[PDB]
Amino acid sequence: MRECISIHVGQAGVQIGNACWELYCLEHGIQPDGQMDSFNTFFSETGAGKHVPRAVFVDLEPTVIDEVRTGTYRQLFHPEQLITGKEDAANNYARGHYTIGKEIIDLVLDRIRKLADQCTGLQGFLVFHSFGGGTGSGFTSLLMERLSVDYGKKSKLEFSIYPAPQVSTAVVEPYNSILTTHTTLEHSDCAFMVDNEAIYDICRRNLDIERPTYTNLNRLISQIVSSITASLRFDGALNVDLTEFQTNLVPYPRIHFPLATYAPVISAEKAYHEQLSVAEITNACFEPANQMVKCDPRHGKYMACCLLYRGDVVPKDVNAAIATIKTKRTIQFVDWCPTGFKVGINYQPPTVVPGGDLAKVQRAVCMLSNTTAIAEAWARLDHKFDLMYAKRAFVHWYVGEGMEEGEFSEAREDMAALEKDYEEVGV
Template sequence: MLRESGGGNREVVGVAVGQAGVQIAGALWELLCLEHGIQAADGAKLDDSPFDVGAVDPCFWETSKGKMVPRAVLTDLEPSVVDGMKRYFPDLFHPDCMYTYKEDAASNFARGRFMVGRSALEGAMDSIRRQAEACSALQGFVFTHSFGGGTGSGFMTLLLERLAQDYPSVTILRFCVFPSPRMSTAVVEPYNSVLHAAATMDNDHCAFVFDNEATFNLCVNKLEIERPTYHDLNTRVAQVIASATASLRFPGKLNVDMADFSTNLVPSRRLHFPVMTYAPVVPPDVIRYHQQSVCDMTTDSFDPSAQMATYGQENGKYMPCCLIYRGDVTHSEALTALNAVTDKSSIQFVEWCPKKFKVGISSTRPSVPNGKYPITLPRSVCTFANTTALKDSWIKLGAKFKAMFEKRAFVHWYTGAGLEEGEFCDAQESLAQLIQDYKDAEGETDVPDDDLEM
């Protein structure tokens, strides 16, 4: 059944945790300001915005002087990255919502969870509560963070545990930097990532994963950027997050609430790590001339070259998928495109899933930052897919974890910060069970033929 959505009155609070999370948030709020006709430097409304500004209530609140302020919290255990956001956005964010502590986690899960994180927890939660209590109908929280950093892994677990106590019925979506196979910022990323995953494994909210290597390759091969920066990578992620919240901010014929992601993408509590793609991805100098049908665009979103996470598509099967269309897309075009996807022999789905697709359509065109003169695409699609192929990434990560732990490399830094050595073994067992869950999900059973939910 089609549902008309007008956006508004369903607020979303964005929470950025750690260096990676805060930097992604910078690109995200720059894009959201662009889409809603707001000046990113000071939150002033632009009278000459070329875009449909939609409903600003879900992501911004307005001061008595007409200034728009993001519903956001930027938090890190050390101040340098958040201070950089203050310089880049001098008058956009409310000062009370930029919380930092005096000591970082030193890329150590245990320091972020047991030592420094516990001291900083109440201050960060106070900032989050202020934003949540200012909402009339809180839809949920959108987190950005990294699995591999000390703050994004350890401190993030504390925040999730406290939010589960204080806001048990509120939806949480997480957009997480997953460790790359060949690109790493810290040698202990496998420890931090597996320990974090084990500590949050029983949460049933979605943790959308991407990695720098796949997103870097996307920028090089698709956007023809010779040397992509982190801002280039973060802008790709920002487009995905903007699509995920488009139904709340703009009118459309098919609505997808935040709760729909968990309902449709998480078949069992532990399998809550969907991957994401965005299409079309074209260089800025040809966007104005780019024309692509809905069917071709949808097919491209399942192409391995469009992946934002490194995994072998051919080594697994898709479980439920959620596609968010924006722009000039009709219901019948989306249905035709999805039928074409299911007919491709290279794209396999598990047989036990009765509803392969959840679809949202927002009529407002997506915006693309392009220097002084931003432009819009005629249409776009963002695909969130849960796939058993991701087990290969977990297997490789587990192998790195095991190789280090067998030699007890760097373990003393974790045990000295309050982590018991037995928790390493528990995390390994949890990861092994997750991998087995993926393998079990590839089993086949008879299901009805009706596999499209529109």
């Protein structure tokens, strides 16, 4: 069957993974200890009955994984799936890659191989990292490269924490992200990217919450992930396998970045002041502020769009909605693509956790989008990098562990090329 493995790497990735696992447990009826039909896509079938997931959990930081190992979702995990080392990169690309990561990576590969050995049709991977964080950027890149050698035909999807233009966390992100882009590019297939500023905005407006945490964010991410994956596991009108997200979303083999957005993301309060019909949901999906990154999508033609409807969904309504969207003048599309939309309709609805603010909905959607409008963010990032690098800010740290500066230049060139390609596409 359509049966697969996940990868959660670095602090952020691990956090996301926890949430994901919780969501999965809710969905498939599994109790935190492994006790309870088609669950087995992730949870490789087990000895005494108690289910155990297929996820690679990696952190060179001990602390986050240590927390997990003394949590509630604890015995659920295999000891080995969770991996440990000694110290952070500390936002240092030249440590996940090159120096310290080239040591653990072998172990990770072995684990992955072992996991694969249970599949009877390994459709691919899901990878969780951060365009920014030191471990989950260099290390993840390295891992992806390794996988490329050992699994050429298998899809490798990535869930990515792009840094928002204005807001920041650690002031060496512009280097790290760029480096990741340079070395991820050719080894991944798809990189689903979500900002944090956008999420915060959504929370403030749509969910009516002005005091968020990371936990909430993680839950939201997990929801999206679930939406993406549910066609593997449950039945459906139209089933979108992992390998479709290659072919209905990558118009050219360097453009690997889609924006992942969810709806309806509205709390219980003015949910009952709403219909929550299919058309409305679709409309919400294409609006600017509901997107989970900081693009003005009205500034950029859509290349490929992909929608994953869940729950009580009649295809006719969906079709109507899509037609309406097509009709709209502001939702721009490329010169070379008429069949812009890819639709998945799944008989199982989304499932809501205790503590998760998003209330119970009979129907919901996850949208995946490729556009020239992502290029703005890239350009901004490039600019940031250039401003940093001319005065040689913090270069000696990465170079002092094991790097050429020409690498940086190469990365910049690559970015420029990407930009040019985007421009061409727009034309």
